[PDB]
Amino acid sequence: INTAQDKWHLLPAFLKVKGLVKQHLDSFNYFVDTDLKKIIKANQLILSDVDPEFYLKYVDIRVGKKSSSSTKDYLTPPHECRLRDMTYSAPIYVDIEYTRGRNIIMHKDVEIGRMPIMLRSNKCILYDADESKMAKLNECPLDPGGYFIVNGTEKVILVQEQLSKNRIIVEADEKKGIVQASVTSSTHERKSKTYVITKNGKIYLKHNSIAEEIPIAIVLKACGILSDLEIMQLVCGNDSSYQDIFAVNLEESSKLDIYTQQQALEYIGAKVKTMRRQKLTILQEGIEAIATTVIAHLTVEALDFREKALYIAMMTRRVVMAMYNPKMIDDRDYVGNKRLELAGQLISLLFEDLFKKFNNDFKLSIDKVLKKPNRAMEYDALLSINVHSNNITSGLNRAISTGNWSLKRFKMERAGVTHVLSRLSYISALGMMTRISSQFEKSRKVSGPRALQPSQFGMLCTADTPEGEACGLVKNLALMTHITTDDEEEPIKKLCYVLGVEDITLIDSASLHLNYGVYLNGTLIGSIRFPTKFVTQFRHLRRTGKVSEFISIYSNSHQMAVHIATDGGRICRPLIIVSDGQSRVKDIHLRKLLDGELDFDDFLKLGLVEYLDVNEENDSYIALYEKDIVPSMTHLEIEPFTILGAVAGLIPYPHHNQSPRNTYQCAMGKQAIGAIAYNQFKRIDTLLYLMTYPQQPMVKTKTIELIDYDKLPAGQNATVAVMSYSGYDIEDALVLNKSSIDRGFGRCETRRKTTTVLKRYANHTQDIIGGMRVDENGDPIWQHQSLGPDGLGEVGMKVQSGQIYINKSVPTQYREAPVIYRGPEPSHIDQVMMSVSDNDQALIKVLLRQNRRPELGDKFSSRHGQKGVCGIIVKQEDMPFNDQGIVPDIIMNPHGFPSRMTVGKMIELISGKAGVLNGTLEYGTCFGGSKLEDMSKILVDQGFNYSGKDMLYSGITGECLQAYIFFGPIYYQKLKHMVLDKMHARARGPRAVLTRQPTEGRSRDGGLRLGEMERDCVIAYGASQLLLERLMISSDAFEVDVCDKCGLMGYSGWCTTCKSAENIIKMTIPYAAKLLFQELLSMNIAPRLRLEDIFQQ
Amino acid sequence: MIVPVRCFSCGKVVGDKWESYLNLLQEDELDEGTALSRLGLKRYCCRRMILTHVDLIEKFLRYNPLE
Amino acid sequence: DATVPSGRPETYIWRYLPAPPVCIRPSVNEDDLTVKLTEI
Amino acid sequence: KEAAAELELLNADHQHILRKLKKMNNKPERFMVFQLPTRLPAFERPAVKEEKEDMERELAGKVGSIRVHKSGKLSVKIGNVVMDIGKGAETTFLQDVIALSIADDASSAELLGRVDGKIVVTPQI
Amino acid sequence: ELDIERVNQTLNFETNDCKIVGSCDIFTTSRKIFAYLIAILNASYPDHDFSSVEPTDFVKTSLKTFISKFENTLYSLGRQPEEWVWEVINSHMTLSDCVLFQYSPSNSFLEDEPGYLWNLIGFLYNRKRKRVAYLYLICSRL
Ligand SMILES: [Zn+2]
Ligand SMILES: [Zn+2]
Ligand SMILES: [Zn+2]
Structure with missing residues (x-):
């Protein structure tokens, strides 16, 4: 009943309690429940410089709920905020401790702005809505959520990826630019970035707060390491090859006659910029430059400069290894070297700086009453809060809507942070989620970040990427992934000493490069004697759940290191643990997983499955199938088809196609049109392409069961005869049936919104909607035929190329400025919506409907990257026909197969044909699916050929065609690129x-x-x-x-x-x-x- | 959103065999391929009309004004 | 080549400055050049 | 193979911890710094082995035992929890002595002894 | 208030190599008014005495002529001056029936400030409400 082919049921168990938009939803839930406190506590108090007694401190913060209220506040529902062009938000109730008169007063529930909340998060009203409450609130339960509604437009904050923040990365080239970044970032206590460069075979130290760069021996002497033999033992060891490379840097310390830490600190004390405030000495400055200026995540607090000296020494050991062997460099494009910055991280950068600028602009107005008269007349200090509270609201709303990212405190000027959510398909709304942006989109190279890496197996989708100007710079995350949550590391540090490391202040610097040193987040901590016993006892504490999951440990060997990472923004991937050549998830666990109990995260707590980082996959050896488990394996794939993401799971049999073909489908599944939502007739959107009779695919995939694609599909099953016909299907054109189009094959529908705002003016005069203009008796003129009595066009009436459907007039003279439908084809008014926005002015949205059928020139496609245009429409007594009388809906040329090598389309047709003759939908899932040798068993069972090739007659001449015609159902999807919107x-x-x-x-x-x-x-x-x-x-x-x-x-x-x-x-x-x-x-x-002159004389 | 009236590739009327297709599956249950043949859909162009028909009119009608 | 009476080397110092035609800098909203001329 | 190499080197450090502990007996004022975990089990009440396993100082004496196994190995048990032991710091090169500080008025730096080596005990996770 | 904060957010900005800092304010705290404005000048700049220049150059000009070039300089600084401002300062002060003054002597007290370029200082005396606005614009260079 259970066997090796049943462990894929963990994938519906993973996605059930997680979902696919968790990287948006969990981050925003982390922000409104944890990170709001860690912003208020970072700047709690307001200090009035005039009269230093009138302080003001914020006790705590919460969004969307008053403390005296036992219920959450009423929010306008998310669909009404789409229609009324409002912002779906929630009030930020801070409560405040302040001084008034001669006593201190707590005041409760001060509203400081409003927070634009994400859909399906905790504070959204769609959270735990039982699909009958979705209908009352006019919401689609198949909508992913994870986005914001700001001024009606629904906006998504994309997943940003940066380079790994607080870790070391080694670059090199010819001309010897061996530089070593470390972009230090403690939140903005300091945001700094050091280098280490070799000039002329001499190691230096550049930093952007230094006038000119310092050599390397007189900066370890600036720290505690000054013995000058141990500098040859911290960066060279006993390796004689490295002692030659560093020996030039020793004598330069003697050449400047630097010999003590007093004299070493005074060198860099006269090399700094931004001397501003204290007028302290060069000793007091050079000892401050090592304090919190160079490597800012390693703040020192006392006399002991040891572990920071060991940091710069282990930077410059990686330089000397790079000078000796030039191939000991770090890949900048490796996925372990990346961090994925999610939406809660970005808004915590954004909301903090607006709360900085709130408190600055509140302090420079809290003294504008103190130093002014009426001294005895005190003031409550809580009447100027709303003067600046419309900057919290308007600065949150503007930065999400514009996408611009102007942070004055943090010094970042990022563009393109948000995007409008795509409503082309159901797939577009889910493909715009799970999408990852990159930093390379300002400067150009060749063959760097655009090539996919082998290190994105299971982490990123290996085909969903655009083609053209962004191929490999936009990328997509797979199904079974998770982004790590950043957690505290000093409990993890104190676990390391108990497990047997001995501290860096206890270890001799001579014998430090004989034992593996542990690295809690790149920082050297100790030195273990027995590393693989230490690593095994740290996985065992994680598999028992004592120390958390998403805490990865891996034992490098060439670096002879044991790294332990715990910071957030790493991409995990669940795997099944195997032990002693045997998969630990037995069939008793799958039996329990099916019948209700023992879900996913009981497979984590009971030690069965495990998240692996990209780095921890180095210290592993992973089986793909249970038949491949050798005793040296240590993990097993839950399911191999999750190498592809959400959009690339629409393809039937991807492993039979060629790989550029499966990438063109990912761009074109988002462009094909069908059903959007269940409120798609209740919504008024800018451009909405729908299909009249969408069908679910005959050949489907497990991946589209999971994402619920077959309940809002985009395409129809065409009967496709793969043959060459009429000479109008030569290079990707496709021959189409006329009687199919007459019955509704491929027939779509366009919807377009038109907003006018009847704005009132400062002159106390208002825009007005006009009236019907009759002539000669009670009938309208041509431009008012579709108008109706109140100037707004009648619902159901046909507007065509010149008529008026909103008759508005601006100013009491009225200058007539109506809207005029200027389209090449007519279109029926289907929805006229009369409402008023937030600032109490009228808002008319008129939706316009247009039906349209396949013309010569519309784009159809299969799900195999074979885009095509309609070349001819054929009369259906001219189409070829079988013995039963079936004629094709599409004829497709046999010349699009050999150069493109889409063999998985030749299996979609048979599995489609054998399935519809059997009555069952088949599967074309990746690395699996239905088999060709028993789809060809069903197909002979009826009396069809095994190979799907039928003997068709000719519709034109009546005769048997001299070839057997490969004939059956392919799922075709119709794209938005239509020739009516392109001919001009x-x-x-x-x-x-x-x-x-x-x-x-x-x-x-x-x-x-x-x-x-x-x-x-x-x-x-x-x-x-x-x-x-x-x-x-x-x-x-x-x-x-x-x-x-x-x-x-x-x-x-x-x-x-x-x-x-x-x-x-x-x-x-x-x-x-x-x-x-x-x-x-x-x-x-x-x-x-x-x-x-032009002319000769 | 609702069943096509005719098969696209033949014009055989299949719109009257959706109300009866669901009764053959729900009561007196059949395995979806002899419930097609019992309705008399021999040609595969006509079987795919109602087998891969996703009925969206039932979900769209949940969101009207209650009226 | 100072045969031309605008040859002379002091014609390369801005004593007089031509105001360009309004065809060169229109107003849709002042232009960038129109707001620079007034500042000068 | 690498877990077998660390096994025999621990087996090499188990005879090497037995010689350097027995030879160090009754040589006066000659010490050995050696590393215990920071948190210890309670002794007013005995925390059982699996309970100290979970959460991970003034004391009297006779709190543990260094047991010598018959096969080749050693294992410290304290209270009722059982730890494992190895000469696991490094072969130290820097020379080490122990100095006692006196607080205010009998102010003296008593030189006690000299460090032989350093052995570590870890909980047997 | 909030609207006064908005019209002060209008008048404080900086373009490429110029920095304009000025604002408007309204508060109740021609022989007797000569001392009534030098206290506003002293509180506006608490580092220069303004009891010295008593027979100063208060060009008693038309307020329409003043707001003309006050709007022209906002065209001249790429601002596209927003009209609601002139109702807001009306709405607190009843701009119509009031008289305007302007401290513009021969050599003002900002010529010694380094980086000084030009100024525009407006006084708007009110009689029935005693509401004097001190509209000032100081263009500097950095
Ligand atoms: Zn039909
Ligand atoms: Zn048919
Ligand atoms: Zn001329």
């Missing part, structure tokens, strides 16, 4: 007022640019009057009046620099050349035209 053409139209050339863009009248590369083409033809006509005569021709003696251009046949109309010549010229000359005369150069 311009003869003459509006011109840009500066260049007086035709305008830009498509949604103007138009203008197609002929630029710099086709000019080259027509020069090569020698066609000189075409080039004169296509560039000047019919782009910007300009009759201008030159002067012959000056060479400048005059107006009206008259020269100005010589007051005469005498020798003025009239010429035609590009207006951009006229615009050039008058911009050169303003720069004080004079282009003087020298003219001559």
Whole structure:
């Protein structure tokens, strides 16, 4: 009943209590429940400099609930905040301790701004909604959540990835730039970043708060390490090859005659910038530069500079190993060297700086009453809070909506932090989640961060990436992943001494490179004698759950180190532990997992499964299947198809395709259209492409069962005859059936919103909606046929290319400025919504519906990256037919298979055909699915051929075709790229007022640019009057009046620099050349035209 | 969102065999492929009309004005 | 080559400055150049 | 293979801890610093072995025992918890002595002895 | 208040190589008014005596002429001056029926401040409400 093929049931057990948007949801839940306190406690008190007794301190904070209230506050529901263009938010109730008069007073539930809350988080009202409350609140239960509604527009904070923050990374190249970063970041106690560079074979120390860089022997002497033999024992050891490389750095310390820590600190005391405030000595400064200035996560607190000296020594040992062997460098693109910054981390950066700037702007106004008269008239100090509380709200809302990230305190200016959530498909809303941004999108290289690494097996999706300008810079996380939670490390440090390390202040610096040293987050801590006994007893404390999971330990060997990482932003991945050649999850546990008890995280507590970091996968050896478990294995895959993400699970049989093909599907599954939501008829969105009769795939995948894709599918099962037909399907065009389109095959529907705001003005005059304008009797004129009596168009009426559907008027004169439907095709009004936004002014949203069917030129695709356009529509007595009489809906060319090598499309058709003849949906999941040798058993069972090739007759001539036709159902999906929204053409139209050339863009009248590369083409033809006509005569021709003696251009046949109309010549010229000359005369150069006659005498 | 009236590839009327398809599965239960043949859907173009039909009119009708 | 009366080397110091035409810098909202000329 | 190499080196350190403890007997004023865990089991009430296993000072004396096993090994037990032992610091090069400090008025730095080596005891997780 | 805080957030900014710092304020605390404004000047700048220059240059000009170039300099600094400001300062002070003054002597007391470029200082005396606004704009250079 249970066997090796049943351990994949942990994957519905993982995703049940976790989900796929947990990296957005858990981070925002961490912020509003933990990190709000750790911002208030970082700056609690307000100190009034005038009269230093009127203090003000914040006791605690909570969002969305008053302390005296036993119930959470009423929020406007998330769908009403989409319609009314509001921001779905919650009030931040701080309570305050302040001084008033002569006694101190606590005041309860001060509202300081409002926090825009994420959907499906704790404070959202959709949290634990039983799908009948989703319907009352007009919400789709299949919506992922994880995003914000800010001014109606729904915005997602993307997963950012940075380089690993507080760890060391070794770079090198030719010309010997061996640099060593360490971007130190304690929150903003200090944000600093040191280097270590070898110039001329001499190791230095650059830092951006130093005037000029310090050599390396006179900075370890700046720390406690000054014996100058142990410096040759901290960076060289007994290795004679490394003692030659560092020996130049020794004598430079004697060459500056630096010999004591007093004299060593005074060297760097005169090398600093930003001497501001204290006027302390160079000893007091150089001993401060090692305190909290160079490597800022290692703050020293006392006389003992030992472990920080051991830090810089273990940096420069990695330099000397890089000088000796140039291949001992660190990959910048390795996934273990990355940290994923989630949405709670970003908002904790954002909300802190606005609470800095709140408290600064509240302190510089709390003294504007104290140093002013009415001294005896005290004030409560709680009436100026709302003066600045509209900067907390407006600064949170602006930074999410704009996406701009302007943090003055933290000094970061990131762009593109948010994005509008995609509502093209159901897949677009889930593919915009699980999406990861990168830092490389400002400067360019070749073949660096754009190549995928083998270290993203199971961590990142190996095919979901865009093609073009962002291929490998946008990436996607897989199904069974988890992002680590940052936790405290001094309990983990104190566990290390109990387990047998001995401290760095106890160990001799001579014999330090003979034993493995432990590294709690890159910082050297101790030195174990027996490392693999230490590591085994630390996994065993984690598998018993004493020390937490998401705490990874791995024993390197070439570095001879034992690293222990516990910081957040690492990507874990669950695996099954095996022991002594035997998988620990037995069939009794799968029997319990199925029938209700013993869920996932009981497999963690009972020691069965385990999260592995990328780094901890080095110290492992992982089996893929249970038949492959040899005794030296230590883990087992729960399920191998989770190498692909959420979007790449739509592909049927991905392992049979070629790999560029499975990447084109990921971009094109997000573009195919179908069903969006269950409130897709209750929502008024900017552009909403729907399908009339969407079908679920015949060949499906486990991965689309899990993400509930077959309840909101996007596509239809076409009957596809793979054959060459009509010569209109040559290079990716596809032949289409007319009688299929007449019945609703591929028929879609477009919906578009149009918002006007009837704004009232400061003149106490308001925008007004007009009235129906009748003529000659009680019937409207043409532009008011679809209008109705109140100026807003009637629901159900047909608007076409010029009519008015909102008749608004601005100012009592009223200047008529109605909206005019300017579309190439008509469209029916389906929804007119009359509401009022937050600031008490009217808001009309009119939705417009348009039905459209497949024309020549719409894009269809299969799920195998084979995009195609509709080339011809064929009459259905012209299509080929079998013995039963079935004709194809699509005919597909056999020439798209051999170059593209999509063999998994040739298996989708048989599994699709054998499944529909059997009555069962089949599976084409990755590394598995239904088998071709017993899909071909069902297919002979009926009386069809085993190979899916049928003998079709010819519809045109009646005869048997001389080949057997591969014939059956493929799932086709229709893309948003439709030729009605792409055909445009311009003869003459509006011109840009500066260049007086035709305008830009498509949604103007138009203008197609002929630029710099086709000019080259027509020069090569020698066609000189075409080039004169296509560039000047019919782009910007300009009759201008030159002067012959000056060479400048005059107006009206008259020269100005010589007051005469005498020798003025009239010429035609590009207006951009006229615009050039008058911009050169303003720069004080004079282009003087020298003219001559065209004709010989 | 609701069942197509006709099969796309034949024009055989399949819209009257959705109300009866669900009764063959719910009561007197069949294995979804002899409930198709009992309704008389021989051709595979016509079986895929109601086998892979996802019925979204039932979920869309949960969100109307209560009226 | 100071045969031209604008040859002379002191014509490269801004004594007089031409104000460009309003066709060069329009107003849709003042322009960047229009707000620079007034400042000068 | 590496866990076998650390096994025999611990087996080598178990004869090497027995010689250096028996030879050190009754040589006066000659010490050995050696590392215990920070938290110890309680002794007014005996914390049982699996309870001290979970959460991970003034005392009287006779708090433990250094047991010598018949096979080749040693294991400190204190109270009722059982720990394991190894000469596990390093072969130290820096020379070590012990100095007693006196507080205020009998102010003296008494030189007691000299460190032989350093052995460590860990809980047997 | 909040609106006064908004119109002060308008008048404090810095462009490429200029830094303008000025604001407006309204508070109740032509022979007798000569001392009534030098106390505002002393409290506005508590490092220069203003009891010295008693027969100063108070150009008693029209307030419409003053707000004209006060709006023109905000066009001239790339600000696109927002009109609601001039109702807000109206709404506290009844801008229509009041008289304007301007401390603009021959050599003002900011010429010795390094980085000084120009100023615009407006006094707006009120009679029925005694509400004098001290509208000042100091353009510096950094
Ligand atoms: Zn001329
Ligand atoms: Zn039909
Ligand atoms: Zn049919």
